[PDB]
Design a protein around this motif. Structure first.
Motif, mmCIF file in Angstrom:
data_model
loop_
_atom_site.group_PDB
_atom_site.id
_atom_site.type_symbol
_atom_site.label_atom_id
_atom_site.label_comp_id
_atom_site.label_asym_id
_atom_site.label_seq_id
_atom_site.Cartn_x
_atom_site.Cartn_y
_atom_site.Cartn_z
ATOM 1 N N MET A 2 -0.854 -2.899 4.369
ATOM 2 C CA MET A 2 0.333 -2.911 4.028
ATOM 3 C C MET A 2 0.269 -2.225 2.693
ATOM 4 O O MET A 2 -0.216 -2.767 1.763
ATOM 5 N N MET A 3 1.349 -1.155 2.629
ATOM 6 C CA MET A 3 1.406 -0.412 1.233
ATOM 7 C C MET A 3 2.249 -1.246 0.373
ATOM 8 O O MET A 3 3.531 -1.559 0.528
ATOM 9 N N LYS A 4 1.832 -1.447 -0.756
ATOM 10 C CA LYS A 4 2.563 -2.169 -1.901
ATOM 11 C C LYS A 4 2.507 -1.267 -3.213
ATOM 12 O O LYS A 4 1.542 -0.546 -3.596
ATOM 13 N N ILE A 5 3.485 -1.421 -4.087
ATOM 14 C CA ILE A 5 3.711 -0.866 -5.171
ATOM 15 C C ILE A 5 2.564 -1.198 -6.280
ATOM 16 O O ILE A 5 2.601 -2.602 -6.373
ATOM 17 N N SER A 7 0.727 -2.611 -9.429
ATOM 18 C CA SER A 7 1.104 -3.473 -10.527
ATOM 19 C C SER A 7 1.368 -2.741 -11.821
ATOM 20 O O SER A 7 0.735 -1.842 -11.859
ATOM 21 N N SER A 50 -7.220 0.449 -6.065
ATOM 22 C CA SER A 50 -6.122 1.125 -6.358
ATOM 23 C C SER A 50 -6.149 2.513 -6.526
ATOM 24 O O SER A 50 -5.434 3.517 -5.975
#
Length: 104
Positions: A2-5, A7, A50
């Motif tokens: 899943m793609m997450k922003i 931090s 990241s």
């Protein structure tokens, strides 16, 4: 899966290092490689991951704006799009970093 922003802490660190490398005339993708290669295993596994994610998206997309969509907040993507068009990536990233810091 899943793609997450990414931090805020990771983005601040990434932006600061990128500004330094870019205004030494290092190309953006080469700069990302440099950050990784010299960062393992000083930096956390997730920070290195990241950067790998950003690199993977740059390879699979036709602009930096598209590559970063979903990885940084939409307001930061918008500033990346103007910087990409004006050919001022370093100063655009510097202004994004400033905004994050000024927000505190």
């Amino acid at each position: 899966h899943m793609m997450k922003i990414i931090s805020k802490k990771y983005r601040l660190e990434l932006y600061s290092m990128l500004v330094d490398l870019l205004n030494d005339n290092i190309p953006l993708y080469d700069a990302l490689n440099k950050i990784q290669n010299e960062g393992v295993g000083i930096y956390d596994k997730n920070f290195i991951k990241s950067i790998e994610l950003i690199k993977d998206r740059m390879k699979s997309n036709s602009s930096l704006t598209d590559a970063l969509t979903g990885l940084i907040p939409d307001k930061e993507v918008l500033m990346i799009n103007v910087a990409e068009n004006s050919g001022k990536i370093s100063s655009g990233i510097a202004a994004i970093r400033k905004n994050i810091i000024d927000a505190d």
